Ligand binder design. Structure first.
Ligand SMILES: Cc1cc2nc3c(=O)[nH]c(=O)nc-3n(C[C@H](O)[C@H](O)[C@H](O)COP(=O)(O)OP(=O)(O)OC[C@H]3O[C@@H](n4cnc5c(N)ncnc54)[C@H](O)[C@@H]3O)c2cc1C
Ligand SMILES: Cc1cc2nc3c(=O)[nH]c(=O)nc-3n(C[C@H](O)[C@H](O)[C@H](O)COP(=O)(O)OP(=O)(O)OC[C@H]3O[C@@H](n4cnc5c(N)ncnc54)[C@H](O)[C@@H]3O)c2cc1C
Ligand SMILES: CC[C@](O)(C(=O)O)c1sc(CCOP(=O)(O)OP(=O)(O)O)c(C)[n+]1Cc1cnc(C)nc1N
Ligand SMILES: CC[C@](O)(C(=O)O)c1sc(CCOP(=O)(O)OP(=O)(O)O)c(C)[n+]1Cc1cnc(C)nc1N
Ligand SMILES: [Mg+2]
Lengths: 599, 605
């Protein structure tokens, strides 16, 4: 009897694929995979308390060190509970594979006329058909490992994303001669640097040499391409200021002489002025999503030509009405091809950008990230000022993950990072409850490493159960919670629209949150409280000095503003609270926009 | 200017449709609908802390008094977080309507080449396309009220289930003349009593009158059809025994002289013997799922003809190799037609079933629901005995919801119910974390009424956040939690298959649960613990007497067995017939219990 259990071959395959961590919850649909993976001992199974957390953890697990993780779900609700995490990785272009069990293969076919498959199953491939790069149900034992190798390769190729491999129970418990195991041969990797693309790189180098006010917009597509180490020599060789997207903040030192912050609808005042006054914009690995460019392409950088570099052809041309060179290429290959042509024999002379770099620094001197608009409201701690203070307590290898709301906004608008530090969050989908599962992924990726989690009273509730997972494994997760009496982000939304009482956003309107210090005690978690500047520095030093999990509530004003912000619809440079008109006129090269004259 | 905001017309439409409660979470995608509904003041919006709980609560909300509820979800994650709830209503045939927001309609179309829509949207309709009765994206303002009326009707029509209506952002904020609103008119209900179906009823009546050992298998389809009050006059006019499915337990008093429990894979020993020894079985409103009939139709009631009644044509004929009359008819209409023919002057003579009824009672005598197999193991309270003790503390209008695990199995195998009591849970999907959201829907359905939630240490974690919703509204939800060091139900699974150390099912294998009493104290919820029988009655009395939410931990053996149960037995391995539940009774006892003698499989065990 020379036959091996299919589940055992899958566990072996996972080792050969380098997958060292798997997140999920056990069930009858994958009890054979849990057994086989455990008995092999190579892949550690982290058991979560909601399958949604397993499909979110695998994301930041990969973003940490570049090793893919698997989510191990079971039949029925085990799979539907993970859909949210799949959609976030789909939207942030993060690779990861889901291995979901199901009923016996005799029930798993779409032609089934019944509402449900077997006892409690369903077509888990059809549900994520439009939010994952690949989905396959294994109906032959001999192709179980095949689809896992294929699922992993497709998750990592091109624009990364999640893949969904469903294996019915009976396929897991089956036995076959290991010799009959099929294996997936990945096709040859594409050569993006075609003669056409190579000519676009030439056109970009001619504009950079000629541009007097260039601005490079760098995005996480660079880090995903493994070319973040090429940014420091590129900017210094070009002498061109650079902006970073919220997702690619940690690719460069925020204090680098040519890095001038983040622009967008929630961008920094000096960053938006730099972007809107440029004469040439070169986006590399950034999606130029709506929160980055506003709501009107004709109002974006009204003095500049805009070139876009993106490995997704659909993303690269979505702004074609406004952009010129739409370069469909890998970010690393493009940067290397641009750095080569800078040393070519016929490399053009790069015109000086000194006057532009000086005007960029003037903008930052005129509009600091934490300005007067961020004054302590009625004595409360101002989140933006708290982020500036917390910044000084970052360790040399600090990893910061955030949820939505105050943590997201205040974090990405103030916090600075240097090489060795990382900043992560889910911005594509922007789902609440991503902070905690994000910290689990980073922690296990660094062998139970330290992680700082900036969270909110509202977002803490979506995956509140993962505190138990944090305690069970003694993860050194420093969890900051911003208390503001509910959904502060939505308070401003409905107050701008209706100018009436709050609805479903605070305790009076039907949304309340528990005392997280008292929950921390229940979970055996040390907890601190920062209500004012008096105990601020002494507390932050203790939180960073802890070796195990710790919670720290930060109390802010329940109606503190989020600023700077583009709000009601002026141009992108005219952020609220509006600056006096005579000052905006002087800050804009060709004068202010006609919309801003009567505001 | 005679124009009205679309969202305000939606709020008006919800009032005309009778929807008085809406569960969900606010977001930019539905902020306009939150505002319009709140300002109108007819539909109460219940804010939950995870959209999943919203799509679950609307189910038990409807099952309580028959009033449909709406789930109000927002763009992106707001919609995805509710998919689990949709599938569970889809699987249990429970009507409900999801109202989901999305990005501006200019992004919301399937031909969009980009991975996402606008800022963070997606095709929420396609995602529930195979687990919902109807999906539509409102693209014209004049059709917003039309699709909600249509959505509600299709949810209640025929075999009930969830519907998904997506209303883009700009469609909610739009303004139109109320006179331009289109309105959906429901077609006339189908008349199921064709000559062909009337001939089936006559065939069923002819078998019932002749059968010596009949058994009616009543399911929740009867309650969904609104004919559960016809069951008493039907059973007493036929004099036949009857079994109830887990979903339809509360349709008849468990102590009625002719109701003999529930059968299946986790059925009661007495009920399985009554099923397997009958000569005629009439299934009405029950789906005859796999946990009910076993794994081989050729072993189900081998001496009996089987007829099935079900409003869904596919569910009605899925056992056509084994069944005889497959009647596709509404459960109430069928029962009315069967009563009309029983009360007729020309009604046929019903042969006496007295000897069979007597044999059914003897089965309950020899096999009580809580038997010697349920002794207290190693100084722990047995969950089956606890349920029998807890049963005595039910209120006259008690409502019991359950999670999975021990609460589900020990609950449905022991608990008895009277007229006016209710018993709900998710059995089609069987998801963990259904208990708390289930107690929310029942509570709000009865004007913040009292609900008993039988939960578990594991299932509590999925929707743990809804403890805040419970304290916020001061809901009198009595929450029992069975502590057994993890996933006891999976422990028995992996112990049967591998007979080795546990994996991902207890503290040592990677799954731990918090001290729910301490956790309760954090949420300002009074908490009690039941470890022995000495403090049991006093604690149960204090839990029931409270006015607000209560938590009560019940500590059981971390490896207690779930029995009776149809499990695999090593002879080679054998899956015994349905009547041979584990732990196995002596063969000579099983022989005497089977009218025709034991099955060939049972002789070697
Ligand atoms: C409320 C809110 C406010 C926000 N405000 C701002 C703001 O003010 N400013 C701001 O900048 N962002 C802001 N964001 C975030 C922004 O909208 C996006 O979500 C994203 O974070 C922008 O960074 P990115 O383009 O690098 O990320 P992504 O959207 O992940 O961009 C990755 C891009 O790179 C491409 N790519 C992937 N792999 C490769 C490869 N190998 N080679 C080349 N390309 C590749 C992908 O196809 C994709 O187009 C906000 C988000 C929210 C939710
Ligand atoms: C671990 C586990 C163990 C279980 N063990 C058992 C067990 O031992 N015994 C048991 O009985 N159950 C058991 N169940 C539950 C069982 O498998 C089903 O899930 C269900 O609860 C059976 O009850 P039901 O058919 O009434 O419910 P449903 O499955 O919801 O049945 C509803 C049926 O009625 C039909 N219907 C709907 N509306 C109408 C109408 N108007 N007119 C007519 N028909 C209509 C529907 O089409 C459907 O076929 C178990 C479940 C689990 C998860
Ligand atoms: C990302 C923004 C946004 O998505 C948006 O609609 O644009 C927000 S913010 C917010 C309040 C959080 O409030 P919080 O956490 O207390 O933070 P703040 O106190 O700092 O505001 C809510 C509810 N939603 C909508 C939303 C709802 N449900 C899920 C799962 N994801 C969501 N994104
Ligand atoms: C039908 C139950 C069943 O589905 C099954 O596979 O048969 C069970 S039971 C169980 C342990 C409960 O553990 P619990 O709550 O502590 O109860 P017990 O102490 O009584 O075991 C788990 C994990 N699962 C699989 C499962 C996984 N994930 C989600 C969301 N839903 C699920 N149903
Ligand atoms: Mg348990």
């Amino acid at each position: 009897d020379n036959k091996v259990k299919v589940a055992e071959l899958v566990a072996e395959a996972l080792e050969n694929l380098g997958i060292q961590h798997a997140f999920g919850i056990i069930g009858a649909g994958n009890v054979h995979l849990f057994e086989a993976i455990a008995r092999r001992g190579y892949t550690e199974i982290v058991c979560v308390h909601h399958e949604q957390a397993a499909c979110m953890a695998v994301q930041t697990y990969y973003r940490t060190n570049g090793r893919i993780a698997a989510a191990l779900l079971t039949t029925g609700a085990g799979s539907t509970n993970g859909v949210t995490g799949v959609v976030s990785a789909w939207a942030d272009s993060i690779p990861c594979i889901v291995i979901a069990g199901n009923e016996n293969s005799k029930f798993t076919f779409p032609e089934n006329p019944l509402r449900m498959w077997g006892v409690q199953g369903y077509d888990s491939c059809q549900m994520v058909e439009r939010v994952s790069k690949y989905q396959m149900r294994v109906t032959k034992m001999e192709r179980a490992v095949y689809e896992l190798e294929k699922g992993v390769h497709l998750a990592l190729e091109g624009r990364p994303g999640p893949t969904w491999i469903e294996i019915p129970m009976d396929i897991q418990s089956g036995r076959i001669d290991p010799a009959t195991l099929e294996h997936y041969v990945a096709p040859p990797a594409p050569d993006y640097l075609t003669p056409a693309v190579a000519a676009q790189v030439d056109s970009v180098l001619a504009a950079l040499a000629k541009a007097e006010r260039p601005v490079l917009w760098l995005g996480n597509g660079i880090r995903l391409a493994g070319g973040e180490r090429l940014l420091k020599p590129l900017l210094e060789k070009l002498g061109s200021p650079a902006l970073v997207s919220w997702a690619g903040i940690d690719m460069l030192d925020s204090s680098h002489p040519l890095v001038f912050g983040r622009a967008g609808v929630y961008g920094q005042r000096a960053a938006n002025f730099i972007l809107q006054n440029s004469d040439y914009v070169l986006a590399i690995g950034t999606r130029l999503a709506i929160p980055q460019i506003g709501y009107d392409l004709n109002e974006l950088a009204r003095l500049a030509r805009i070139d876009v570099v993106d490995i997704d052809g659909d993303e690269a041309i979505k702004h074609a009405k406004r952009t010129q060179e739409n370069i469909v290429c890998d970010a690393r290959v493009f940067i290397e091809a641009l750095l080569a042509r800078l040393n070519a024999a016929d490399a053009p002379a790069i015109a000086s950008k000194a006057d532009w770099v000086a005007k960029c620094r003037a903008y930052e001197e005129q509009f600091p990230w934490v300005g007067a608009e961020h004054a302590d409201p009625e004595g409360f701690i101002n989140s933006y000022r708290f982020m500036e203070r917390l910044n000084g307590f970052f360790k040399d290898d600090q990893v910061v993950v955030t949820d939505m709301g105050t943590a997201l906004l205040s974090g990405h608008q103030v916090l600075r990072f240097k090489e060795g530090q990382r900043f992560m969050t889910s911005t594509g989908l922007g789902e609440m409850g991503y902070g905690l599962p994000a910290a689990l992924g980073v922690s296990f990726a660094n062998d139970r490493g330290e992680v700082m989690c900036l969270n909110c009273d509202g977002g803490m509730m979506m995956n509140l159960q993962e505190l138990q997972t944090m305690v069970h494994h003694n993860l050194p997760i420093k969890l900051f919670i911003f208390n503001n009496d509910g959904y502060l982000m939505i308070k401003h939304t409905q107050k701008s629209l209706f100018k009436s009482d709050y609805v479903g956003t605070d305790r009076k309107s039907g949304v309340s949150c528990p005392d997280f210090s008292r929950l921390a005690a229940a979970f055996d978690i040390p907890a601190y409280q920062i209500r004012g500047w008096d105990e601020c520095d002494a507390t932050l030093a203790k939180v960073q000095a802890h070796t195990g999990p710790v919670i720290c509530e930060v109390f802010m004003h329940p109606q503190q503003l989020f600023s700077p912000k583009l709000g009601v619809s002026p141009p992108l440079e005219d952020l609220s609270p509006l600056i006096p008109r005579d000052v905006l006129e002087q800050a804009m090269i060709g004068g202010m926009h006609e919309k801003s004259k009567t505001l």
